[PDB]
């Protein structure tokens, strides 16, 4: 019995409800309040120019068709109730491939207040494309954006807004950061408008500022290049008589330098421009060549 009153309330809510029509389809604008909690900022793949991110995407709006009065003020229903009511069709403009996690059940929660407010959260992983300029590689910083808006609802029908102050509406968990060779300095949010053929839409923008860590590359390339240059120099102090030793210096230095030059390029994607690493390698190669030229002169 005690469960029957709530069943009656839920049945009363749904009857005569058309989930094909957005709230206030005639007069007003559905104003969706958004919010993000980033449980982990995933790895950044410079080769594919993309990053992964895991979030608790929260959306809230008001639906006057779902007002109720009963013993409790807030209803905490399963995730199969959200398929019966109308919900906004948000999507990520610059996303590549996302998953809405489904184990063990759909990771969604719906909560209905007695005044008709809805809170709709869901856990999902996003792979978003992040354009990168690698001229200063590996001494470079990036701002990887995450833009989302509505599919099929222009600004005249659905408008998004941040739940709290825009500076506090994207929260990054303290312990969640899966970045290996990057540092997350901070984030900034902006809200704008985008024009398209189908109409004019609202876009919520978030930038995550990243700075690359140079520790790996220093040991990997820079020190080996310096040591190869020094070994190439060593040839000067050798006695003039021992020609084969100096020839061996030259050949081994040039061979290892070519191998290092090949190795360095695979660390980043194919780009027509030349990175700082390439300039350093070229200058060191020029120094080796100059040592050989000075050898020939002497």
């Amino acid at each position, epitope marked *: 019995d005690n469960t029957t009153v709530f069943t009656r309330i839920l049945d009363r809510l749904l009857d005569g409800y058309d989930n094909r029509l957005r709230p206030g389809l005639g007069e007003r604008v559905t104003e969706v309040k958004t919010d993000i909690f980033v449980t982990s900022f995933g790895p950044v793949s410079d080769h594919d120019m993309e990053y992964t991110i895991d979030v608790f995407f929260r959306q809230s709006w008001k639906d006057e068709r779902l007002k109720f009065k009963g013993p409790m003020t807030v209803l905490r229903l399963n995730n199969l109730m959200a398929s019966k009511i109308w919900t906004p069709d948000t999507f990520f403009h610059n996303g590549k491939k996302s998953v809405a996690h489904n184990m063990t059940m759909p990771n969604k929660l719906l909560r209905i207040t007695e005044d008709g407010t809805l809170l709709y959260t869901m856990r999902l992983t996003v792979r978003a494309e992040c354009p990168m300029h690698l001229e200063d590689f590996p001494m470079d910083a990036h701002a990887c954006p995450l833009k989302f808006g509505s599919y099929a609802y222009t600004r005249a029908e659905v408008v998004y807004e941040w739940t709290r*102050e825009p500076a506090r509406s994207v929260v990054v968990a303290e312990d969640g950061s899966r970045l290996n060779q990057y540092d997350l300095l901070g984030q900034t949010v902006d809200s704008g408008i985008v024009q398209s053929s189908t109409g004019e839409y609202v876009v919520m923008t978030t930038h995550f500022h990243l700075k690359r860590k140079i520790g790996y590359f220093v040991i990997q390339t820079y020190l080996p290049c310096i040591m190869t240059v020094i070994l190439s120099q060593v040839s000067f102090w050798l006695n003039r008589e021992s020609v084969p030793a100096r020839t061996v210096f030259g050949v081994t230095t040039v061979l290892t330098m070519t191998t290092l030059s090949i190795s360095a390029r695979n660390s980043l994607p194919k780009v027509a421009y030349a990175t700082a690493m390439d300039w350093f390698i070229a200058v060191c190669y020029a120094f080796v060549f100059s040592a050989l030229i000075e050898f020939a002169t002497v």
Partner: antibody
Amino acid sequence: VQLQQSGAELVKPGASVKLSCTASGFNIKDTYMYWVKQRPEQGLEWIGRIDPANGDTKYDPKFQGKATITTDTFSNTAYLQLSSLTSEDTAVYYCARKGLRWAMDYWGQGTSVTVS
Amino acid sequence: NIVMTQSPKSMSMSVGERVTLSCKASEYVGTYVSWYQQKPEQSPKLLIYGASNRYTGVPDRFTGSGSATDFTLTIGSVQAEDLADYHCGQSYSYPTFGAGTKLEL
């Protein structure tokens, strides 16, 4: 649509007082209420705000402790309470709404506080 | 926390001349700036919300230009009834306001 703020008042120094901001044409539960103080011939100063849906409040560091903001959701009004009033607190206090990109679209008529 | 500096502190001209007001943010506020005008013995009125959007019931004379930190308000063909203060405020964080600009004559 309209915010009917309290009338003018006079308070002796060192006392405490409270101000009301009645709201009509909408439910305060849907937005944030703001309190702004404007000393004569100076720029506006933000006091604090309240989220009526759950009573969460944030205050400007200067006014921390000095002011307390609460909402009577049933009567649909917000309250500002000033304590330990001094002679530099005499100003005009405004009650402001929020909407459309956090712009303070609507304002009250302004309430005058005078300390002798 | 975020300081908003309005320049000029005061400036004036005759009716019809183009007038521009400049407000600059100490830190980044991404188009969450607003402009209000406060007539004497009156409460502020919202003029421009967002960086550039024009509030309903506002003449097309007013226009706002946005940026990350540098914002401006231009009143093309100022009339003789625009003789009120002008406050720039940012809402990216807990709201703050500029010192205001006085417009006379």
